[PDB]
Amino acid sequence: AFPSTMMDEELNLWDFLERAAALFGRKEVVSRLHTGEVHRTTYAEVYQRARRLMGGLRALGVGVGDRVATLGFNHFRHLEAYFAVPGMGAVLHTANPRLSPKEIAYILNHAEDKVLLFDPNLLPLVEAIRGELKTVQHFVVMDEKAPEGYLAYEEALGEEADPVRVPERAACGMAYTTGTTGLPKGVVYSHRALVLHSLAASLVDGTALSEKDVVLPVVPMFHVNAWCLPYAATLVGAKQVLPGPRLDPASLVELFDGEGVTFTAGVPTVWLALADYLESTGHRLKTLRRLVVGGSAAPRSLIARFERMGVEVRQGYGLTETSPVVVQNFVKSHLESLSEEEKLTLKAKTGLPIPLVRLRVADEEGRPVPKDGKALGEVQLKGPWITGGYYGNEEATRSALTPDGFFRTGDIAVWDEEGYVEIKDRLKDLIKSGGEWISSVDLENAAVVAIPHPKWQERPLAVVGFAKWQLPDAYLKRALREQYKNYYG
Amino acid sequence: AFPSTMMDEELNLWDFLERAAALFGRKEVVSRLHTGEVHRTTYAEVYQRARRLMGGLRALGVGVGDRVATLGFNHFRHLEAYFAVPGMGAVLHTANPRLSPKEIAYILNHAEDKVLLFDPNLLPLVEAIRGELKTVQHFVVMDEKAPEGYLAYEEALGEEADPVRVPERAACGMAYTTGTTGLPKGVVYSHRALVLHSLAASLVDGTALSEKDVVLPVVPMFHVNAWCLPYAATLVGAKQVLPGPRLDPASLVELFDGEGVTFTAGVPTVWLALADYLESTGHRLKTLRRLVVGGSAAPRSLIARFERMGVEVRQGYGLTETSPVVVQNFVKSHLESLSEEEKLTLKAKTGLPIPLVRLRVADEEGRPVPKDGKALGEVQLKGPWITGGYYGNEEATRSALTPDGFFRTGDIAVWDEEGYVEIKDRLKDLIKSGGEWISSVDLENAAAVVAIPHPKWQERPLAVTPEELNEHLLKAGFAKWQLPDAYVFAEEIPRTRALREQYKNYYGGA
Numbered sequence: 001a002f003p004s005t006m007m008d009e010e011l012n013l014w015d016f017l018e019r020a021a022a023l024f025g026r027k028e029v030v031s032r033l034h035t036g037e038v039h040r041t042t043y044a045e046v047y048q049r050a051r052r053l054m055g056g057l058r059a060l061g062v063g064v065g066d067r068v069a070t071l072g073f074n075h076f077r078h079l080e081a082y083f084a085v086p087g088m089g090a091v092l093h094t095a096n097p098r099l100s101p102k103e104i105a106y107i108l109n110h111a112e113d114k115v116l117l118f119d120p121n122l123l124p125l126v127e128a129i130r131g132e133l134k135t136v137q138h139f140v141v142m143d144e145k146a147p148e149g150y151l152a153y154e155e156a157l158g159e160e161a162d163p164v165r166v167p168e169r170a171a172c173g174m175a176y177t178t179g180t181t182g183l184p185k186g187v188v189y190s191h192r193a194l195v196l197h198s199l200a201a202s203l204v205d206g207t208a209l210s211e212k213d214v215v216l217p218v219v220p221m222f223h224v225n226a227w228c229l230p231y232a233a234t235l236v237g238a239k240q241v242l243p244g245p246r247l248d249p250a251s252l253v254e255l256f257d258g259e260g261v262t263f264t265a266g267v268p269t270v271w272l273a274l275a276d277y278l279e280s281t282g283h284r285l286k287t288l289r290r291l292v293v294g295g296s297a298a299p300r301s302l303i304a305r306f307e308r309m310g311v312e313v314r315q316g317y318g319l320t321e322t323s324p325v326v327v328q329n330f331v332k333s334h335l336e337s338l339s340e341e342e343k344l345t346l347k348a349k350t351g352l353p354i355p356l357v358r359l360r361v362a363d364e365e366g367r368p369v370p371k372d373g374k375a376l377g378e379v380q381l382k383g384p385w386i387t388g389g390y391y392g393n394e395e396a397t398r399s400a401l402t403p404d405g406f407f408r409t410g411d412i413a414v415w416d417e418e419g420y421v422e423i424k425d426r427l428k429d430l431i432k433s434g435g436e437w438i439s440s441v442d443l444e445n446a447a448v449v450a451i452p453h454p455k456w457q458e459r460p461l462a463v464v465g466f467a468k469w470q471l472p473d474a475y476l477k478r479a480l481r482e483q484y485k486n487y488y489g
Numbered sequence: 490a491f492p493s494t495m496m497d498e499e500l501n502l503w504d505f506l507e508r509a510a511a512l513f514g515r516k517e518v519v520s521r522l523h524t525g526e527v528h529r530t531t532y533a534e535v536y537q538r539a540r541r542l543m544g545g546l547r548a549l550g551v552g553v554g555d556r557v558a559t560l561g562f563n564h565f566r567h568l569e570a571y572f573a574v575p576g577m578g579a580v581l582h583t584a585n586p587r588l589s590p591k592e593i594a595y596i597l598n599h600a601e602d603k604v605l606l607f608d609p610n611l612l613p614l615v616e617a618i619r620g621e622l623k624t625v626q627h628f629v630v631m632d633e634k635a636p637e638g639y640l641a642y643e644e645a646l647g648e649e650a651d652p653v654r655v656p657e658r659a660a661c662g663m664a665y666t667t668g669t670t671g672l673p674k675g676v677v678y679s680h681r682a683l684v685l686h687s688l689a690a691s692l693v694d695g696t697a698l699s700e701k702d703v704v705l706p707v708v709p710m711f712h713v714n715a716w717c718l719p720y721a722a723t724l725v726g727a728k729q730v731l732p733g734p735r736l737d738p739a740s741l742v743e744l745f746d747g748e749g750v751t752f753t754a755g756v757p758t759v760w761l762a763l764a765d766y767l768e769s770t771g772h773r774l775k776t777l778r779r780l781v782v783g784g785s786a787a788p789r790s791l792i793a794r795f796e797r798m799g800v801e802v803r804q805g806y807g808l809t810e811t812s813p814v815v816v817q818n819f820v821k822s823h824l825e826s827l828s829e830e831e832k833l834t835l836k837a838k839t840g841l842p843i844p845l846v847r848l849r850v851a852d853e854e855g856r857p858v859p860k861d862g863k864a865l866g867e868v869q870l871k872g873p874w875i876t877g878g879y880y881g882n883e884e885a886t887r888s889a890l891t892p893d894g895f896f897r898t899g900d901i902a903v904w905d906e907e908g909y910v911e912i913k914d915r916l917k918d919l920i921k922s923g924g925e926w927i928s929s930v931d932l933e934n935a936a937a938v939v940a941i942p943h944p945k946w947q948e949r950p951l952a953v954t955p956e957e958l959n960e961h962l963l964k965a966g967f968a969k970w971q972l973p974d975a976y977v978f979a980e981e982i983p984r985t986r987a988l989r990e991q992y993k994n995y996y997g998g999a
């Protein structure tokens with residue numbers, strides 16, 4: 001009816017790195033490899049090599065819309081791939097190496113990945129599933145050297161190439177979730193989604209990411225793209241410290257103090273081990289001011305634990321299906337007058353819905369439940385970075401949405417007049433141990449329930465093809481939980 | 490083929506207020522009206538009343554794409570209009586009341602505004618131009634009451650209507666700039682542009698806007714939508730303090746302390762008057778932490794004066810054509826170890842290009858100039874909230890764009906290796922006085938008019954009896970504020986910048 005005079009310019013993830021090279025080219029990207037060695041590079045160097053990776057991947061037959069998979073932890077080569085793949089108009093498929101060999105082979109075949117990039121210490125896993133893969137044409141070891149039948153990352157790098165421009169709604173990356181019944185379900189993100197997501201979650205009431213920040217993603221780069229942290233840190237031009245597979249407290253403290261980390265994010269399990277170590281050694285982190293916890297409900301003790309040491313803890317919530325951030329916790333200005341007990345209770349809640357997200361806690365008919373912090377209902381979402389369905393799964397798609405088009409998280413929650421959400425339960429019958437999923441129904445079909453654990457957050461308990469961490473520790477199910485609520489302490 | 494699984498949800502300005510009402514509904518919106526009185530409301534009330542304004546405007550015939558104009562200062566009703574008009578799929582035309590009656594009549598006729606909302610103290614101006622208007626059907630006074638032939642705002646409110654979602658690329662608002670040659674040129678903003686603009690400019694390295702902030706936009710809601718501040722403040726759920734037409738230092742100080750203002754934004758002229766007041770009285774602001782200055786190059790002394798009082802000063806740059814923010818100043822982490830003098834100089838610079846902005850300082854061929862902070866070139870921009878032309882003007886459109894699609898600002902600047910831009914000069918021949926444009930060429934025709942530095946205003950016209958020349962200009966339709974301060978005579982004007990260098994310190998300007 002009335003067109004605007006605004007330029008039709010597309011949002012693109014490559015713009016984050018292109019800006020980082022131009023304005024903050026000298027800012028560092030520090031990586032700790034699997035061997036323990038520390039690698040140092042910069043945004044300018046990462047930008048140069050990411051351009052070389054684009055030309056290199058093109059030589060291997062990667063075109064627009066093609067899937068390029070990764071199996072690796074947090075380091076600079078993974079960060080180069082985080083930009084090169086979406087930069088050339090291809091799809092970054094970050095796969096989880098902690099899954100079963102059968103799960104990984106299924107998702108690589110389902111996504112029809114053309115090229116696989118993986119860490120040197122994950123070679124045995126790749127050697128094991130290689131015979132099962134039907135689409136991967138080139139196997140690339142993220143290192144200087146590669147064994148026979150394998151291509152080395154540094155050898156794979158080609159001539160510098162310009163980024164390919166695509167409509168912002170086009171695919172940039174994809175990830176499969178194991179937090180469902182049956183087969184893993186695929187979610188395909190767009191440039192538009194991840195750019196908007198990076199902006200809205202970086203605001204002051206969110207992560208408050210700044211150029212002055214030194215960012216350490218403890219969250220794996222195969223968990224919803226490390227919660228988009230590497231993208232958002234590049235956007236602001238913050239220094240990045242990538243810890244690799246070593247997430248033990250001594251290894252982290254070393255990077256925390258040595259590189260002057262100011263902001264970090266990870267799952268509760270890792271933070272509990274860190275807090276335990278800091279308390280036992282009487283050590284205080286000299287620069288860390290802000291800590292984000294997600295993936296699972298952060299215990300009240302974990303927050304108070306870190307506040308005691310001068311570390312601000314902010315909870316965040318989301319799904320593979322939501323990019324992932326939809327909810328972030330912060331204390332409102334008028335609620336600062338609350339007592340320390342009441343404030344801790346508020347901090348222990350899930351948090352407030354973030355900008356550009358439409359959140360509701362609703363019933364079976366889709367009607368919002370009372371905002372009294374007591375009535376239970378399902379968290380339902382709507383927005384530009386929330387999935388509208390699944391890739392190559394009609395049955396999973398048609399049950400993912402409500403009649404009025406809201407995504408169903410499968411999470412039972414309450415909400416109050418202040419707008420705070422608080423995850424209470426789960427509709428989907430699953431177990432989340434140390435940030436990773438275990439299917440109850442898949443265990444039963446071989447009764448199993450999720451039992452609270454101090455360390456992991458849930459542990460399976462079987463009442464009488466799977467890994468050792470999936471094995472139940474000890475030996476109409478809505479009652480079995482309330483009976484053994486304190487079986488694992 | 491291989492699409493994303495992401496929802497096709499549009500970006501809409503209405504979501505800012507909807508979120509504000511649902512999470513921060515009790516947060517206050519405080520307005521000082523033209524009478525001096527202080528009005529208090531909340532985001533929940535504003536949201537409820539904005540819904541009623543949508544229903545009311547629809548009853549007045551406002552459809553999707555229709556233009557609704559405003560002639561008013563900063564208050565709750567303008568904030569309600571800021572959301573209701575775009576929320577119903579209409580276009581909010583924020584008009585500048587400081588422009589000449591002929592200019593206001595021209596821009597209202599050009600935009601084909603159907604409804605006009607105006608402040609009560611601006612009745613004489615509206616009465617003076619009413620006969621010249623051709624499209625305005627309803628005249629709404631932003632007050633409880635209205636004279637015969639005029640509709641009261643409170644009367645205009647109808648039934649609570651649900652917002653209408655339009656494509657994000659579609660128009661949400663428009664504004665005309667008098668910073669060109671000839672008649673004003675129109676720029677049409679989209680929902681997409683302003684939502685992205687509000688997000689990017691609100692980051693820590695920008696305005697760092699938060700729920701806990703108390704925001705006072707001194708920048709008028711008719712200056713590129715108060716620099717998009719009222720939208721961004723609603724987005725974060727910050728308390729809003731809207732000062733109205735009274736921008737004198739004493740009135741502002743009362744709001745700064747009385748409402749606990751933490752963040753504010755405005756033009757240099759306003760901040761110089763405030764600094765003068767605080768230094769003269771010995772009064773110190775008890776809550777102000779962050780001050781933003783834009784529209785003109787902030788003087789080094791102005792920044793130093795506020796930093797001395799504990800107020801952080803950050804420069805920002807933009808145009809009506811750019812929404813407006815494209816550049817924001819902040820000190821880089823590794824530059825914090827610089828001395829007070831070096832840091833102050835860095836703060837005096839324009840700043841760094843903000844996220845989702847493609848900035849370059851280029852020559853006449855379109856090639857980037859060396860990054861030595863010396864080589865001069867034109868600032869050229871590309872991005873989602875940068876205009877790709879002007880409304881209903883093909884000629885102005887093609888002359889404002891480079892072959893490769895960059896927008897030409899008409900600003901001469903230098904840039905360095907750290908990425909800092911510094912506006913040094915202007916290609917366009919104009920004078921910016923107190924944030925408002927004066928056309929030198931228009932003053933020339935009616936012999937030579939140049940911009941000369943001024944302590945208070947920013948630049949002031951100078952023509953190369955002084956009383957004769959004034960009355961001739963007044964008769965040609967020029968206001969008292971547009972008249973050149975002084976007249977200097979010569980013999981020959983070098984035909985085809987020298988005069989500006991010859992009379993640099995004629996008004997003792999800095």
Ligand SMILES: [C][C][C][C][C][C][C][C][C][C][C][C][C]C(=O)O=P([O])([O])O[C][C]1O[C](N2[C]=NC3=C2N=[C]N=C3[N])[C]([O])[C]1[O]
Nearest residue numbers: 201227228229232294295296297316317318319320324423
């Ligand atoms: C840009 C940067 C930003 C960042 C910050 C924030 C962070 C936070 C986020 C996190 C998210 C997580 C992810 C995940 O986990 O996903 P998945 O795997 O798919 O899963 C989902 C699930 O889980 C759970 N959760 C989560 N989170 C949480 C939980 N719970 C409780 N709480 C919390 N927080 C649920 O269940 C879901 O569903």
Ligand SMILES: [C][C][C][C][C][C][C][C][C][C][C][C][C]C(=O)O=P([O])([O])O[C][C]1O[C](N2[C]=NC3=C2N=[C]N=C3[N])[C]([O])[C]1[O]
Nearest residue numbers: 690716717718721783784785786805806807808809813912
């Ligand atoms: C939302 C958030 C908010 C933030 C804020 C920031 C600040 C920034 C803003 C400012 C901008 C202004 C705009 C304007 O002014 O427009 P116009 O009127 O159109 O004009 C344009 C012109 O002007 C000038 N400038 C501006 N700014 C500046 C300047 N100069 C120098 N410096 C500075 N800063 C130029 O010339 C342009 O062209």
Ligand SMILES: [Mg+2]
Nearest residue numbers: 177179319320
């Ligand atoms: Mg999931």
Ligand SMILES: [Mg+2]
Nearest residue numbers: 666668808809
């Ligand atoms: Mg202009």
